[PDB]
Amino acid sequence: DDLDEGIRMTTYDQYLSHIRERLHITNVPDPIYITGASTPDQIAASVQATHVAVVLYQSGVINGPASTYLRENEVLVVMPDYYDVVSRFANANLQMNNNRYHESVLEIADIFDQADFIQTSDAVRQLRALMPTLSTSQIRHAIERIAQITDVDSTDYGKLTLRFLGTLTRSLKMQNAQIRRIRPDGTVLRYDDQIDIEAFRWSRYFLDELQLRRLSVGLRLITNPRIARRFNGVRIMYLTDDDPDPDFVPDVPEGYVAVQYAHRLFSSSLANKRNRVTYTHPPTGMAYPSPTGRPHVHMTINERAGMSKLVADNIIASVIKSNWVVDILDIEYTAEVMTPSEGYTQHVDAESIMTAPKGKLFHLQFMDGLLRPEPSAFDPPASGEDMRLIYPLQPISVARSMRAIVNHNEVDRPRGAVAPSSYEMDTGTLSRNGDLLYSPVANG
Amino acid sequence: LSDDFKQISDPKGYLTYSVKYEDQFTKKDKLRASEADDRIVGPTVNLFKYGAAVVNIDLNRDFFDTATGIDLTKGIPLVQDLLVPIGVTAGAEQSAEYVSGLLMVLFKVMTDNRLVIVGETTTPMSNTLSTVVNNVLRTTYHNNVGVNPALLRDFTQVNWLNRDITNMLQQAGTKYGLGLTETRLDYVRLVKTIVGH
Amino acid sequence: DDVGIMQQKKPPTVVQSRTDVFNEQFANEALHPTTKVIFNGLDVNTEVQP
């Protein structure tokens, strides 16, 4: 089964947050619970009823014909939680497993048919995943700042201004909020077309239709790969500077043993009348007081938190003296790509990469030495070597469009030169509704 | 009337080509295009001149200005004082600025109210244009054609590039064109008539 | 392909001078390319041949 294939399902929280109010808004019966005694025909009646292909899980193990129905019809089960999910289905073939799943964003547009009540895409979810967890006070801060950027007097907003109790700020956090009539008891009532006006039907995040229209373009811009230049994670490896391409990530060789960094590894120990910062290798448990002579180690380093300077330095010494390949995933950096003529304006000590605060943006520079002319035939030999330690973990030159606009032998292209992608030049046409489109590929 | 829009001519886009040159590379030969073909193809050829080590696509610094609080000096957007720690000063060069910056791109694009008006145009006679440019031009064009790599065809002396761009142009799937075109909206009147460029 | 003529920019040239004994340390080691070289004087090719 393909990762896309299988039984779709989501937690109940996602359901109330996104599916349910929209169900109330289209005036359909609430989708049926699926207990152990649920025939596929009932589920079919419910799916045809709600026009949404969703069924909340109720209780008891689900029988297999229902399971094949949900799988083939791509019906979206909602589950209270993800504990022991397999137990909730009868495993006829025993193929299903708790670890055998594929988590993924699923846009509401792919389940609701009516376009009036859908505004955004997966993009907002992605950008939210980029955000830090936010206190209500922090959220108020972001809001007031966005007002400040846009010259709005946001003062006394979200704030009671009582004569005697003083100012009292309340939360500004109302994600996915709706305008709704309430019973005098103070509890809410489902939006009735009979009383409440149509403008109150669906808030549309409280933006003008036009701002939504533009918001779609903006999400496509933010979620574009070419704008994602905040790279994270570097490989520290002792290597002669060979490959011209900035995007060079050296392969970890054959004999190397991966080792997650942990404090338990490095330790003090007596070793030849000295208190050496010994490393112990988990595959064998052997101790290696000297950075020299250590086994090849692809040491991942998820966090440089408590890592002591003796240890950081000892690791780096292992990278050199013992060809350890360490991969620091904690780092987040911008990467300027230098032409060979501008060289390297900045100079990163090993210590700075092993001690830069988490969450500070590092700024690394990377040569594209492809535009570097051949040495003169009588230029003196270079006795010593040119070595390099910092490497990217991911492709860097993502904004790159064209590379090395120069000839090689007045016809041949230089190896690694890049012509612009064809899409840069398509200028197709407006669609029937007026959307932009690339030109047709095949004639039909 | 309410100023719902912002009339402008020769619009600036969100993305723009940045380019780094290695300045020791220049072709010994010197091209001599006709004045009109230089008026059209020129900003492009001047931008993608020989020795261009790289040609990147950055967000337009000129559009997402500091007035929007963005700082595109390093490759990413960076907006200070949006997502910050409360009760202690935020650190400089904080990574959070990137996410903050993205909001400002999104926000600034959410509220672009620019509405294009035609700028100065030109209607070269076909005889003053080298034939490929005539294939690409559509009777008339804004004087401020910006860069676009398809223009380099039969113009860059960098041969592999010209060969490759010629390939992508002659492929059915892509078709560069420039200036006035037949929109479905043509002849529609709104005090002034609409046209497509 | 061409031989360079204008003087090209070069990586900085660290000059280790290894001795009978020494205490090697790699804290604050350079990360961008450097040309390590072991000897103090190496413009040894001085007899130009017209």
Partner: peptide, 26 residues
């Protein structure tokens, strides 16, 4: 004579729209 790097990026030329008093058709 030392080699040098350089850079350029296409300029904005977005003027606010002009107010012609001339008309182009009857």
């Amino acid at each position: 004579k030392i080699a040098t790097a350089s850079s350029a990026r296409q300029a904005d030329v977005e003027k606010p729209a002009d107010v012609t008093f001339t008309i182009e058709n009857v």
